[PDB]
Amino acid sequence: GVLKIVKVYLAVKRRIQPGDKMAGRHGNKGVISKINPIEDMPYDENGTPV
């Protein structure tokens, strides 16, 4: 009981968002909660934000 079929993909570009988990190769499991602004972000001598 079907004439034809129409397939439509749905690609989503998931961007960074506070809620995921980050872990390298050593096992430093962590989680982002609050994004630290650049204004109140200390730096070195030459001026390089962390």
Binding site: E39, E45, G47, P49
Partner: protein, 322 residues
């Protein structure tokens, strides 16, 4: 108390222009203590408090969206637009300038291949936009430069193909600000230092006017203590979001006659908001109404709290948004 020039007044003694991009200016008259409090109250005044200009909207002749890959291109439709993010152009005194790009054949598309506008000053003509592999492949975009307040996410931005694919932005001139100590070498006394500010601007705003502007912002942030004739109110805003859902009600809530219930609906009137927007001076022109058919409506609107000649909000209500 006294107050009579007890400290030294900072004055521009000598500037250093090591490069056309980076400079090393410095002041001399600085007491031990002001070489840090003035450097800290400036380091955070040029990381987001700077206008600048950058690329935001782009057209591309051939590509429809960030998925369609244009032929005759080494990279994909994505990477070739990421290059425009680095493309910096300083505008004389405009906010909306449309630039056109056009060329053919092999060779990296430089920034000098774009149209030459008088009000448009190219910073780095040797800027690469896209590489053409096929000699028969052409490339053309409508790169326009605006003036935001630093960075504009594409996700926040983006029917029919008009603006199509867009890119990010980076109006922020300098990306890093640093400060050094260093003891000044005057000919008067010994206890004197020098600020010395290092700035790495993309090439839009020269360091000499950028640093001075930074301190100017702080000056205006204290003009209320210098006793100046500036009588302006701070913030007198009153926010309390409210609306009138009753206006979204049809005209069948005013108790009318069959006559008016057939004349109004025939004149594109289904809601009470579609009638108030008009005036009782143009409705008399239609050979299907009158003056008694308007004064009767206003009589009922008196209880609802509505009347002819009033603006509307959130109208029309929920419809068929395309």
């Amino acid at each position: 108390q006294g107050s009579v020039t007890e400290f030294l007044k900072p004055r521009l003694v000598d500037i250093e222009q090591v490069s056309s991009t980076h400079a090393k200016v410095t002041l001399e008259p600085l007491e031990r203590g002001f070489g840090h409090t003035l450097g800290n109250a400036l380091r955070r005044i040029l990381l987001s408090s700077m206008p600048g200009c950058a690329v935001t909207e782009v057209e591309i002749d051939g590509v429809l969206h960030e998925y369609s890959t244009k032929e005759g291109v080494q990279e994909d439709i994505l990477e070739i637009l990421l290059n425009l993010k680095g493309l910096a152009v300083r505008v004389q005194g405009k906010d909306e300038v449309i630039l056109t790009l056009n060329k053919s054949g092999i060779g990296p598309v430089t920034a000098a291949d774009i149209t030459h506008d008088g009000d448009v000053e190219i910073v780095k003509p040797q800027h690469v936009i896209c590489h053409l592999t096929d000699e028969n492949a052409s490339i053309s975009m409508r790169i326009k430069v605006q003036r935001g307040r630093g960075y504009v996410p594409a996700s926040t931005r983006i029917e029919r193909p008009i603006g199509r694919l867009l890119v990010d932005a980076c109006y922020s001139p300098v990306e890093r600000i640093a400060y050094n100590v260093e003891a000044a070498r005057v000919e008067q006394r010994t206890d004197l230092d020098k600020l010395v500010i290092e700035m790495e601007t993309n090439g839009t705003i020269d360091p000499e006017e950028a640093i001075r502007r930074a301190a100017t912002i702080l000056a205006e942030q204290l003009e209320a203590f210098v006793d100046l004739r500036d009588v302006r109110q701070p913030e007198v805003k009153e926010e309390k979001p409210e609306f009138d859902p009753i206006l979204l009600r049809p005209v069948d809530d005013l108790e009318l006659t069959v006559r008016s219930a057939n004349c109004l609906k025939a004149e594109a009137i289904h809601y009470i908001g579609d009638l108030v927007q008009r005036t009782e001076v143009e409705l008399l022109k239609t050979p299907n109404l009158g003056k008694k058919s308007l004064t009767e409506i206003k009589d009922v609107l008196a209880s609802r709290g509505l009347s002819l000649g009033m603006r509307l909000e959130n109208w029309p209500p929920a419809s068929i948004a395309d």
